[PDB]
């Protein structure tokens, strides 16, 4: 086509979606990880995760307001990945890398799994 | 912080949100423009437009499944702007620029209004 493109548009959209999350605006699901609860937008979760994409395209699960993750999933690993989904920023540290990689493999977040594998190989 | 960043994340999120829109997945509102109806995600509309942001943060309007725009709004101008919201690409042409600028001013999409003003000034 003959379109023009606004370079910062996608980043600005994601920044505003994170502002809505921080104010709990139009969040339509609670993700339960052990005792911890995380409010989010189903669409953002689907856009970032192969697991949430499969869950919310399912005719029965698409209507659930509560999703419970596997008890093996670490709440801190999930929190770091949820923050990444809404910001493009991953808080990857020596003390959390194993929990982050395991959670990203479960959530099916291919690019996060790849950088965790590379950072682990380096050490 | 000591975060790492995935450059393509925001663009990949927006691309997936557009894929959900094209398949009509988790769309929660219909925008009526004259006779034409457009299905969309409230969160994406809010992230892109000052008008939708004001509408869906309103305690009564946040629950509406149908929003009717001012009858002066041109359906083609709205369609071009809705496509921009989900792609970062604006189909700006000599024959649509006036309708696009008027719709962007109404929707409060500041960056679109700025490029329309610049393209009009040049001609």
């Amino acid at each position: 086509d003959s379109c023009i493109q606004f370079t910062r548009h996608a980043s600005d959209v994601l920044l505003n979606l994170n502002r809505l999350r921080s104010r709990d605006i139009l969040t339509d699901v609670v993700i339960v990880v052990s005792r911890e609860q995380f409010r989010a937008h189903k669409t953002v979760l689907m856009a970032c995760s192969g697991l949430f994409y499969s869950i919310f395209t399912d005719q029965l699960k698409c209507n659930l307001s509560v999703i419970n993750l596997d008890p093996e999933i670490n709440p801190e690993g999930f929190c770091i990945l949820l923050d990444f989904m809404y910001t493009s920023r991953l808080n990857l540290r020596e003390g959390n890398i194993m929990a982050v990689m395991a959670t990203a493999m479960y959530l099916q977040m291919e690019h996060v799994v790849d950088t965790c594998r590379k950072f682990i190989k380096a050490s | 912080d000591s975060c790492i960043q995935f450059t393509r994340h925001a663009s990949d999120v927006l691309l997936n949100l557009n894929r959900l829109r094209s398949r009509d997945i988790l769309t929660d509102v219909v925008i009526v423009v004259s006779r034409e109806q457009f299905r969309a995600h409230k969160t994406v509309l809010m992230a892109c437009s000052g008008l939708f942001y004001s509408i869906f943060t309103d305690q009564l309007k946040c629950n509406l499944s149908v929003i009717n725009l001012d009858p002066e709004i041109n359906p083609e101008g709205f369609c071009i702007l809705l496509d921009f919201m989900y792609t970062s690409r604006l189909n700006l042409r000599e024959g649509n620029i006036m309708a696009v600028m008027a719709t962007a001013m109404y929707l409060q999409m500041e960056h679109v209004v700025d490029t329309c003003r610049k393209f009009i000034k040049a001609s």
């Binding site: 379109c3 023009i4 493109q5 606004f6 370079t7 | 690409r89 604006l90 490029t115």
Partner: peptide, 4 residues
């Protein structure tokens, strides 16, 4: 704005 750019030419994509």
């Amino acid at each position: 704005w750019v030419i994509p």
